[PDB]
Design a protein around this ligand. Structure first.
Ligand SMILES: O=C(O)c1ccccc1NC[C@@H](O)[C@H](O)[C@H](O)COP(=O)(O)O
Length: 247
């Protein structure tokens, strides 16, 4: 991985020693990015609802993962499940239970630094994975991207700045997440996010990530060309908000 300091250095060390999960895979892959394109075509707001019990920025919510996913399944284009254990209180177990309970696309969200984690995502039932440009070197990102594609997954490649975008474009990313939150400092910068969204090629499926809590924010973002919106905190605190978001 890249040179890292702080909590990022720590979570990457945890991922490096994350034990693999052996399991048989049932349902075939359901492409999240393609479903996003069809929701766009049918003019339905594409929301990726995220399940996370805890977060370094302070979220702490107790809500049943299964009931939450089944409810979200009625409206969401896909689900994002945190499997990182120490900071997000996620687990492979929760992803497995959810994947057996819903039939919409599932993104496994963790800090992926090795191939066995993609093997884990596949065996657990996820349809795609998140790859973060800022914690990986360009060679690692490229290998991991090709590896995810060997399972028929188009990974969501997350960028946070212009340098991330240059790398993402160079390696041929077709599905990009623009995170308004800096992983290292936890600061949210909406303006920087909008600047990056405006630089992305029109043929790349774009997902706005972090800090969305109002329907008007979704509308502004949609006009900038964003294809889908990944929302976690506001939905975890109030699942019913999904109804306002898809209006
Ligand atoms: O949410 C956090 O507190 C946080 C802190 C440090 C690093 C990453 C973090 N979030 C990871 C990120 O993938 C977010 O969960 C999603 O983009 C959704 O964010 P939200 O809607 O909850 O603001």
């Amino acid at each position: 991985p890249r040179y890292l300091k702080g909590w990022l250095k720590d979570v990457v060390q945890l991922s490096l020693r994350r034990p693999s999960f052996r399991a048989s895979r049932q349902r075939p892959i359901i492409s999240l990015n393609e479903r996003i394109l069809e929701f766009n075509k049918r003019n339905i707001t594409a929301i990726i609802a995220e399940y996370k019990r805890k977060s370094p920025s302070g979220l702490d919510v107790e809500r049943d993962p299964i009931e939450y996913s089944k409810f979200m399944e009625r409206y969401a284009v896909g689900l994002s499940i945190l499997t990182e254990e120490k900071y997000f209180n996620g687990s492979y177990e929760t992803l497995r239970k959810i994947a057996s309970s819903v039939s919409i696309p599932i993104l496994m969200k963790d800090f992926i630094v090795k191939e066995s984690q993609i093997d884990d995502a596949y065996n657990l039932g996820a349809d795609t994975v998140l790859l973060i440009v800022k914690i990986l070197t360009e060679r690692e990102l490229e290998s991991l991207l090709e590896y995810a594609r060997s399972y028929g997954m188009e990974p969501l490649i997350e960028i946070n700045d212009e340098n991330d975008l240059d790398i993402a474009l160079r390696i041929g990313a077709r599905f990009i997440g623009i995170n308004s939150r800096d992983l290292e400092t936890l600061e949210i910068n909406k303006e920087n996010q909008r600047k990056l969204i405006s630089m992305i090629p029109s043929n790349v499926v774009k997902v706005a990530e972090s800090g969305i809590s109002e329907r008007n924010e979704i509308e502004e973002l949609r006009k900038l060309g964003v294809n889908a919106f990944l929302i976690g905190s506001s939905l975890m605190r109030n699942p019913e908000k999904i109804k306002e978001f898809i209006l």
